[PDB]
Structures are given as structure tokens and as C-alpha cells.
Symmetry: C2
Subunit: 126 residues, 2 copies
Amino acid sequence: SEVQLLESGGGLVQAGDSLRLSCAASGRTFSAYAMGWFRQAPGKEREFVAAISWSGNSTYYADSVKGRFTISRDNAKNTVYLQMNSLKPEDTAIYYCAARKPMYRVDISKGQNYDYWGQGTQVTVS
Amino acid sequence: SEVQLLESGGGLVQAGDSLRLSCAASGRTFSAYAMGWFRQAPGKEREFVAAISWSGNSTYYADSVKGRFTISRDNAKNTVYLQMNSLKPEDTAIYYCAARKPMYRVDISKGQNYDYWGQGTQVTVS
């Protein structure tokens, strides 16, 4: 079995706006997983955005979003959130949520260390 | 002192409300330091609340407040913030912002590892 992940909240927004993305887990218990957001811009490779420990007691951000984005989770609702403030055109991307087992202390910024992925939600900043 | 800290935003709130505290700095600016928030109520030991790293790319939270509180920093405005959602009467306390010179690996949840402290702002949750 696999955790199933479904991202939501993407759409078209204007430069300077905020947008909150969310990812709902099913199939498997969400508190069993540490979570990460990644994003892929048009024509580029996927890149790390943010990560949160299984309980939500520790977060980590890429330098390109720190201070503007906040990752959080609510395990009692199987949801992890990415609050994006002060958006710019360069933040245009498909945004993915990924899950990994906390068993292994890894480079939490590398997608290869995550085991399960959502389908992506697209965000377009004009 | 190298740096003096002054917190604001406390007050009386109803359970379930939110509040954002802030801390201002004079002397050396916040950009030189890692920061944390602590709290203490009469008759109780001082408790660690949240920490933010020197560069602002990592945060760490006590289990008592994870998922409800967010620590952030705005160097340009020389300010650190603690956003508190879903407040409970157990949250009532004087909240203190502390600074640490970011030179060594230490336990960021221990007040003894901090170097500079504000005067505190009182939060009361009915």
C-alpha cells in the first residue's frame, strides 16, 4: 500500500498576491510521514520548496522562498499546507507535495529521498 | 548591551482568537542573530515556544504549540514575529523574545543558550 496525495489550490494570481496550497492524504496515516513541497517551472527541472517533520515541530525552506512561504500541517485533518506570500512571476510552476518515512535522516531538500508524490497543482503568477 | 529587544502586541483575547506578537531591536540589528520565543506564567517554569535560524530557513516548535504558532523574521524591518492561532487559556503567559549569536551547534530549545532577552509582553486568553 501507498499513501495517496492530492494537491489543491492552484490557479491564476497576480504578482504580489498570496495563495494557500493544500495537500490531502488518503489511503494511509498521514502522521506517519514527513512531507515536502517541490515545484517545477516551465521548461525547468523540479526543485525543492519546503519541508516539515512528521509532527510539524521542524520546518526547512529553500532560500528562494524563505520568509515568503510557510509550510504547516494538521494531521487531524490529513492536510499539509503551503502558504505563499508576495508571489512573483518566477514562482509560476506546478507545485507537488511528497511524503517520506521519517526512519532515515536524509537531505530533505532532494526529491530522491521522498517515496510518494501527488499529481501537482498549477500556479500561474502574472 | 550589544542589542536590546522590545516586544509588543500582547493583550487580552478570547479562546480561539489569534494574535501576532512582534519584537523590535535597538543597537545591533536582528539580522546578526538567531532568535527564539519563550514564555512564562507565574508559578510555572519558563517554556520554550519557537526558534528561527540565523538565515530564516529553519524553524522549530515546542510540542505544546506546533501547528498553531508560527515564528518569522523580517530583517529589512528589523522585526521578529510570533503568530499565534487557536489560542487556549493554557497559552496565558508573558512572552519573551530572545537572541543568540549563531556560532556553534547548541540545543536551540534551551533558554540558557540565548544571549539577549526582551522585557516581555503579557498575553491573556480567557
